């Protein structure tokens, strides 16, 4: 199964991007399977997995964006995958969770995954990234640096591809 | 072996009406068909009670809730609803092996069907099937199928799936098991 | 047991909270004021015998790393409702790892509050307690009370004399004032009705240094 | 693989090669040949020690005295290279030996310091060792190549006679020097 | 994955590598290692970096709350004492190990601990995949009566030899001073085409 | 490993080895394998390290408890005892080879678990080497002063075959007012 | 065991990069090694796989190549070594030398040359290949900025080195001194 | 590893695949299946890579050595025998492939699958794709049938076969082996 | 799938037509019959090459024996000279797992048809089976066949068995190369 | 077992125990394992009976045929050598632990087949108890006498903790002008 998930973190935009693709076995199932659930986050590995932790997730993370209006830390959030996912040492999910998007107010991207630039999932993705990366770049440049990492590993790679999803996050604009 | 399809103004679906254990079937009218609302119908493959003693599980609260609430739930809230059980029972003593296919039609939201796998892989489905014979099928309902068609044309598009199960795979599934659900609500074929 | 003491008088009050709130009215004086470097708190205690010691039991613990309490009410109360104030910023910080925001932690203090007054076979807490904290760009003075309402405050007082405390924390002070000069109306409001001081600012929680109390 | 000798060390002195190992032949925890010398003198100079199963090592100690004694009635790169044909070829039948050897030889100003694994793998390198400093002894010979590119008589000779110490200390030290084929 | 501590004179310095491999790929060049269990102790880790990092959020816990208690800074031995149960009784499903180092009045302490829970004080320990390599040189160079700043001179070293040496352990090396004289944290420490746009 | 007891006179003489090896590589030279579970009864250990700490010091919790109550030294059966049901209870989840003293009186465990009381034992898998060495002097009419030089020159021929014991030969002397420990 | 091969020739150059390192296991043993021996002026050839296989492999090959050096007394091309040295995997395949070797051999027609390998003979003519432990990391990159240039030397010589400085701080089995041997008509330039 | 294969009134039109893998890493999408061994008359790849070479290999070099000797072409019944009867020898050892033998005799289509299942058919798709391959393959196909339609044909159902099959990517490879013998008819993209 | 019947003045036989490997039949013109004489005819279900690879090596012997003795062999001759080769088969490194009928017509010792058991256990069969559908049919045949039969009869006998391998058995077997042997010599049906 | 080998002045004195058990059942406790492959040299076994009855035999056939042509009693390492290829070229369809003496010169063959010239050697799975015993007495300046109370009395040592080994200790004295064999 599982699924690739780009990120990547160059100027105050927060790119991230994956694949649109999860297979029962070595069929395609469907062209088009979420993965990048709105600060973002990108699971990827089983499909059970992306969708039971993006709803335990989401339910944890509205208990407190209820309890305070006050958006989420990304480090914080962090935090709470990572001690939701660490419950289970004896049950491990398989899923990598990637989050990607600002630090609130202070426009300050903050990327990280789970067990510059975090790639995780199925995948070709650290090693085609890393001497690629500029530490600047406008969105327009982000997409683009982000798009070639995202189009010329999947392609490679068997078990993903076959659509990509980009979100480049900006308080400005938030493109796809 | 089940398919479905989607489409402009109806969800299609059908199944075979089998069931064997050991070298013979032992009967042909078995009901994959687990009809649970009058637009909300699972068809469930799968080995043994797991299949029934799911589906109605299910059914029970589905239709639970309609009393409860005097009102009837979306294909995708049934869905997410069924998805989260079998999510459950991955991690459980007991895992069900039950491939299933979640159609609906939501006046609203519009008609979907959703493909559902053993493990708990929900996901909304243009046209899917399952079984084994979907690894054959699949691919005469992804070259045919385009966004248009007409349940009219549905009928020839579903007769044409027919023949892979017949002509160049092992097992015989003889009688389909079609239905519609549309506005109207579910109708057999 | 397994039913609570906590029950309606005939127009719907609970006499046991009621009779906890008069448990508050007992206990020395506490005070504490949001200045506008940080708040502080401050209480009286008394050698009272003369063989006592200064150093054992302050009624100011710190909770958090920039949290403290100071209680008014039965001090035998305060030494466990302290452990489970504790209890849930140092889990706060395992799942969430931040230092808990201060009106959480007086939150969920103040559902423990509550628990009792709805709890078989226990009476609620006597003790009422500032809470106050400062994150982010705000100092923040808290109240819990016996029957966990709580209360953010600009100024506000409690034990003996607190009816007075608050009537001079309003007209002798009002906006800010810098720290040692909002603790100008603390020692002078806390005169109206030993001591044990501390403060907050940004300097991690902080008790007075007892050098510069005097 | 039965009773097992390690800790053979080489190392390079300028016209010269230390060659140190200690004397045990361990079978299980027991240490039931505490005497065993394991440093073979193969030519007027050059030398091979092992570290493995020492029935592997008496079989090409005798194996590579018959091919020197006849070639010699008919270098230490061309014990090596055979030697990685010997160790390979008994792995190819999957009967390897379990021997890891070291051939330091001084030829024409130059220290061959081979190395060849049981499963046939081999090169030269200038500060060898094997088993348990391959691990330990390892950065300790490295430690004064990262400051020094090139060792002297005197200073890998130091290196091993510390390095030893760093089996128990009853360890032979061969050394070939411009002559060749010492031990002490 | 190189982690070392050293028991010089004024206490311990620890230190550790900034590297965290999953199998065969580096996913992580600048990963710390030296959690804070508390001001006065700190704890590196070794072996799974999840198990490393969640154990020891929980003696940080463990032990904040204790001291917040008290009023008085922790002991090295409770943190060992706790850290010994902790890792006992899992029976190696918590399979990293921790190498603790702190001072308490009682003066310097630096358990290496395995993660089936043994505790050992000793004036060198090393873990990690480079501890082979890294104890050698700890052997042959470490030395009692050793000052404070040639420490730095014998860990910055020492680890170096994991990282040149070993496979799993590279990059920059984080060096962590505990003294009750002054603490240190030297974060990142001792360091030994453009795909066109439209 | 290499555990060596011994008893007689005032008190026990006995004395383990210094290394705690995992594997081939050692893990310390330095490790007290003698050490106290109370002023009297100071315990010594086989199996592994790990299954030891969590016994022996839940032993010294029980016996320092033992102590308080009865106000008494507490017995060495007692706490051999104990080191019986905490080995027999878990004898599948546990490694403990034990060779308990006091004060002198020599018991030991076996790691399944059975405390029986020995005069003389030897535990470990370095301890067998020593048996021709032990069972050829241990001898009725020797004085306190012998059994110091016997078991000390004991464990070091255990040691030269032994490629798990080394280090320093650590001897407790456990007695009525005293407790000599040489290295 | 393992590390990286790659190689790349369009024009005449046949570009035959690897890392010196052999490990076995962790421990890496010789920091000097070349995985890319020399065969012939021409001749050159990477073996990244298994050392103690790739050293009695390539003896074989130069063995086998002299052999025909004296048979037809005509040197060996390095189409014929493409076809030859699948036939010498097969004939130890049940079982088999886990060896992925890169062919660089100078082209009659003064051209480049590279030919992939599998452990069981799959020889591939191709712009460029690399092989080893970090083959995953260098593929698309490689191939993106490689595969309207006249295959540039100077630029590819640099898209040669920074892909294994990129590698070498991500994969732990490519490291140490790099060693780069050109096939150009003036002979193989180490 | 999808290469499939039918024959029809105006010739015998085999289609392949470029992809081949190791893992879910893909080595190259180079690589054309449909090894040569005869002007006339032509090999497949399927299952594993080396294998189909080396078998195919043999297979042309006996057939070379027959149409020597014999002074006569082999046929597709020949040819299939003969390579039937070499890979069976091998059946235990896992050598696995699917290769067809395919050309204009009227047209011979044989399977040839390496356990030795030289069957005749007419229709095929052989590999990992081939249950694809299939249900696109008998919809269009008739006997009737022109030599642009069966390219269209061939076309369409080896790009619904790498749709799907994770293992299959890369570009189509049309020989048609019509009356005269086979021709390159198409080496055309899939990305299109 | 295999039947075959003994009738008063012949012998008839008849043989699923189909294989397949992995889920689908990759032909149904496969001919499982294995003429070799005028009057000597293996039928092989068995999975591989082996069926063939050993069907083959026994014709090219039989036909072998017919030129170099200048006469046919009987179907007993040909059913033991098969059974030798069988049980030389089951004690070497290749064990052939082929299940055959060696149907066959003597003039003076009258029609035959012989089971074979892959392992090589011999018996000559009133009627016989062979095939997992030889669980279903070998009892619809062992109730309706007497002594008596006609070639005009055994017709609706075998066509009344082939109902089972559609209607009760889970494969589909679609074909049956029906075949008799009669003094005649074979014919196909 | 138990095989205990000592050297010196005129020829070896060495010994061994007299039981040849399968398993726990004893299966004689007469035998002599102490047996000769020629007038100078016998072979002394460990390892099972039954490899070593296949081997031993076949080196006396090879060595006193050795004898023979050379007219000299052959080679104590000679003989030694042959156990070497025998045990050497099937080490897995061979178990043996010879130790081999001649006239004196104790030579050893562990099973895996190294022919390590030893001085005193002990072999079996009761030998090892010895160990203590044998390293703490054998010493330069004992006369002959010596070694015949010193192998008698190691051997019974190691007897008491091995439940393999018991019987009559049997003892070769195998020299210049004589073979004393006492039990």
């Known amino acids: 199964n599982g699924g690739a998930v780009m990120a990547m973190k160059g100027k105050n935009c927060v790119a991230i991007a994956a694949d649109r693709r999860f297979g029962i076995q070595a069929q395609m199932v469907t062209t088009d399977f979420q993965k990048i659930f709105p600060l973002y986050i990108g699971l990827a590995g089983l499909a059970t997995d992306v969708q039971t932790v993006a709803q335990r997730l989401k339910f944890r993370l509205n208990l407190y964006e209820l309890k305070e209006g006050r958006q989420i830390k990304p480090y914080t959030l962090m935090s709470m995958v990572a001690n939701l996912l660490y419950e289970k040492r004896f049950g491990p999910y398989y899923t990598e969770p990637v989050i990607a998007g600002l630090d609130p107010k202070t426009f300050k991207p903050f990327i990280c995954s789970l067990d510059d630039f975090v790639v995780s999932g199925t995948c070709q993705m650290y090693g085609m990234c890393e001497s690629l990366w500029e530490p600047n770049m406008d969105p327009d440049h982000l997409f683009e640096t982000i798009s070639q990492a995202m189009l010329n590993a999947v392609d490679r790679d068997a078990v993903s591809g076959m659509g990509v999803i980009v979100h480049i996050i900006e308080k400005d604009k938030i493109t796809t | 072996y089940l398919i479905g399809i989607q489409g402009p103004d109806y969800v299609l679906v059908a199944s075979d009406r089998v069931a064997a254990s050991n070298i013979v079937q032992m009967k042909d009218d078995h009901d994959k068909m687990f009809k649970m609302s009058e637009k909300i119908l699972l068809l469930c493959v799968g080995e043994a009670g797991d299949t029934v003693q799911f589906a109605e599980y299910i059914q029970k609260n589905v239709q639970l809730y309609k009393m409860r609430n005097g009102y009837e739930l979306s294909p995708t809230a049934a869905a997410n609803f069924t998805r989260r059980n079998l999510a459950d029972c991955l991690r459980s003593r007991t895992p069900y092996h039950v491939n299933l296919l979640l159609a609906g039609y939501d006046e609203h939201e519009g008609p979907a069907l959703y493909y559902m796998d053993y493990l708990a892989a929900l996901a909304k489905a243009p046209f899917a099937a399952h079984g084994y014979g979907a690894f054959l099928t699949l691919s005469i309902l992804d070259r045919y199928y385009t966004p248009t068609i007409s349940r009219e044309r549905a009928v020839e598009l579903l007769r044409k799936c027919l023949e892979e199960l017949q002509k160049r795979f092992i097992l015989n599934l003889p009688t389909f098991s079609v239905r519609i659900i549309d506005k109207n609500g579910i109708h057999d074929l | ?214 | 693989p039965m009773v097992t000798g390690t800790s053979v060390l080489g190392v390079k002195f300028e016209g010269g090669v230390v060659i140190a190992a200690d004397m045990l032949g361990s079978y299980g925890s027991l240490a039931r040949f505490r005497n065993i010398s394991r440093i073979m003198r193969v030519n007027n100079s050059t030398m091979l020690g092992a570290s493995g199963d020492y029935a592997d090592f008496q079989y090409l100690k005798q194996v590579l005295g018959q091919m020197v004694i006849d070639e010699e009635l008919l270098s230490p790169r061309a014990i090596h290279s055979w030697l990685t044909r010997a160790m390979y070829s008994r792995r190819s039948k999957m009967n390897p030996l379990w021997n890891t050897m070291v051939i330091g030889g001084y030829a024409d100003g130059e220290s061959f310091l081979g190395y060849v694994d049981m499963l046939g793998v081999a090169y030269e390198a200038p500060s060898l060792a094997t088993g348990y400093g391959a691990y330990l002894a390892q950065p300790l010979l490295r430690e004064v190549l990262e400051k020094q590119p090139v060792l002297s008589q005197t200073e890998a000779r130091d290196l091993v006679e510390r390095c030893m110490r760093v089996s128990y200390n009853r360890f032979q030290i061969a050394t070939v020097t411009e002559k060749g084929v010492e031990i002490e | 994955t190189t982690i070392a501590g050293v028991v010089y004179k004024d206490g311990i310095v620890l230190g550790a590598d900034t590297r965290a491999t999953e199998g065969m790929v580096v996913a992580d060049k600048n990963c710390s290692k030296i959690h804070f269990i508390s001001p006065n102790i700190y704890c590196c880790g070794a072996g799974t970096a999840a198990d490393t990092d969640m154990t020891t959020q929980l003696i940080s816990s463990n032990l904040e709350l204790h001291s917040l208690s008290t009023g008085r800074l922790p002991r090295v031995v409770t943190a060992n004492r706790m850290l010994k149960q902790m890792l006992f009784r899992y029976q190696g499903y918590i399979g990293a190990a921790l190498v603790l180092g702190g001072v308490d009045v009682t003066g310097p302490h630096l358990y290496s601990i395995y993660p089936h829970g043994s505790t050992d004080k000793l004036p060198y320990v090393t873990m990690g995949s480079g501890s082979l390599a890294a104890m050698a040189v700890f052997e042959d160079k470490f030395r009692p009566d050793m000052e404070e700043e040639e420490a730095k001179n014998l860990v910055s070293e020492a680890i170096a030899a994991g990282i040149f040496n070993d496979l799993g352990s590279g990059s920059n090396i984080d060096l962590c001073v505990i003294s009750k004289n002054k603490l240190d944290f030297l974060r990142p420490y001792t360091v030994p085409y453009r795909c066109e746009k439209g | 490993t290499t555990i060596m007891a011994v008893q007689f006179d005032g008190g026990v003489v006995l004395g383990a080895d210094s290394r705690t090896t995992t594997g081939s590589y050692i893990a310390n030279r330095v490790t007290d394998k003698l050490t106290p579970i109370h002023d009297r009864i100071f315990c010594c250990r086989s199996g592994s390290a790990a299954d030891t700490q969590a016994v022996a010091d839940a032993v010294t919790y029980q016996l320092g408890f033992h102590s308080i109550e009865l106000n008494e030294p507490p017995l060495v059966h007692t706490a051999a005892s104990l080191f019986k049901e905490m080995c027999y209870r878990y004898r599948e989840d546990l490694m403990a080879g034990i060779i308990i003293a006091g004060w002198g009186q020599v018991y030991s465990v076996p790691m399944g678990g059975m405390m029986v009381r020995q005069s003389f034992a030897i535990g470990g898998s370095g301890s067998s080497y020593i048996y021709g060495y032990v069972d050829a002097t241990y001898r009725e009419g020797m004085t306190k002063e012998e059994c110091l030089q016997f078991t000390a020159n004991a464990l070091a021929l255990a040691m030269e075959r032994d490629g798990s014991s080394g280090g320093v030969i650590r001897l407790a002397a456990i007695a009525e007012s005293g407790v000599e420990r040489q290295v | 065991n393992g590390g990286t091969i790659l190689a790349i020739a369009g024009e005449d150059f046949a570009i035959v990069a690897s890392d010196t390192r052999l490990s076995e296991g962790f421990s890496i043993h010789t920091r000097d090694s070349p995985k890319c021996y020399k065969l012939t002026d021409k001749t050159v050839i990477g073996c990244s796989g298994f050392h103690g296989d790739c050293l009695t492999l390539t003896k074989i090959i130069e063995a086998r190549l002299k052999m025909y050096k004296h048979s037809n007394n005509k040197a060996m091309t390095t189409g014929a070594i493409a076809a030859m040295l699948s036939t010498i995997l097969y004939s130890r395949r049940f079982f088999p030398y886990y060896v992925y070797n890169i062919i660089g051999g100078l082209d009659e027609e003064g051209k480049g040359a590279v030919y992939s390998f599998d452990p069981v003979g799959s020889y591939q003519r191709d712009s460029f290949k690399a092989g080893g432990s970090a083959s995953a990391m260098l593929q698309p990159l490689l191939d993106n900025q490689v595969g309207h240039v006249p295959l540039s030397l100077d630029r590819a010589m640099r898209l040669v080195k920074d892909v294994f400085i990129s590698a070498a701080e991500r994969d732990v089995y490519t490291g140490d001194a790099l060693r780069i041997c050109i096939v150009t008509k003036e002979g193989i330039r180490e | 590893t999808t290469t499939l294969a039918f024959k029809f009134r105006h010739g015998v039109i085999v289609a392949a695949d470029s992809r081949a893998t190791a893992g879910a890493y893909i080595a190259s999408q180079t690589v054309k299946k449909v090894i040569e061994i005869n002007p006339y008359l032509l090999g497949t790849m399927a299952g594993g890579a080396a294998d189909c070479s080396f078998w195919e290999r043999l297979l042309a070099r006996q057939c070379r050595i027959y149409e020597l000797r014999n002074k006569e072409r082999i046929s597709v019944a020949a040819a299939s025998k003969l390579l039937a009867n070499m890979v069976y020898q091998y059946k235990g050892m896992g050598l696995s492939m699917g290769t067809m033998i395919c050309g204009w005799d009227g047209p011979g289509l044989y399977y040839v699958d390496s356990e030795g299942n030289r069957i005749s058919g007419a229709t095929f798709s052989v590999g990992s794709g081939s249950v694809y391959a299939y249900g696109v393959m008998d919809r269009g196909y008739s006997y009737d049938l022109e030599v642009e339609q069966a390219y269209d044909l061939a076309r369409r159902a080896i790009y619904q076969a790498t749709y799907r099959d994770a293992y299959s990517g890369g570009a189509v490879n049309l020989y048609h082996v019509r009356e005269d013998g086979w021709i390159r008819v198409s080496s055309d993209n899939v990305a299109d």
């Open chain 3, 1 to 214: 047991y397994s039913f609570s003491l906590t029950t309606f008088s005939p127009s719907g009050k609970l006499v046991q909270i009621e009779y906890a709130l008069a448990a508050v009215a007992g206990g020395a004086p506490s005070v504490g004021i949001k200045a506008a470097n940080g708040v502080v708190l401050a209480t009286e205690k008394k050698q009272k015998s003369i063989l006592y010691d200064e150093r054992s039991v302050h009624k100011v613990e710190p909770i958090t790393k920039h949290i403290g309490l100071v209680y008014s009410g039965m001090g035998p109360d305060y030494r466990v409702l302290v452990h489970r104030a504790r209890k849930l910023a140092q889990q706060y910080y395992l799942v969430y790892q931040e230092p808990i925001p201060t009106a959480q932690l007086v939150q969920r203090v103040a559902s423990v509050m509550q628990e009792y007054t709805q709890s078989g076979g226990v009476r609620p807490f006597g003790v009422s307690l500032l809470i106050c904290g400062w994150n982010e760009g705000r100092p923040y003075l808290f109240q819990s009370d016996p029957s966990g309402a709580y209360f953010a405050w600009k100024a506000t007082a409690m034990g003996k004399n607190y009816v007075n405390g608050k009537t001079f924390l309003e007209k002798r002070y009002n906006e800010d004032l810098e720290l040692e000069d909002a603790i100008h109306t603390a020692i002078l409001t806390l005169k109206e009705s030993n001591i044990e001081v501390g403060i907050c600012n940004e300097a991690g929680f902080r008790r007075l240094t007892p050098t510069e109390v005097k």
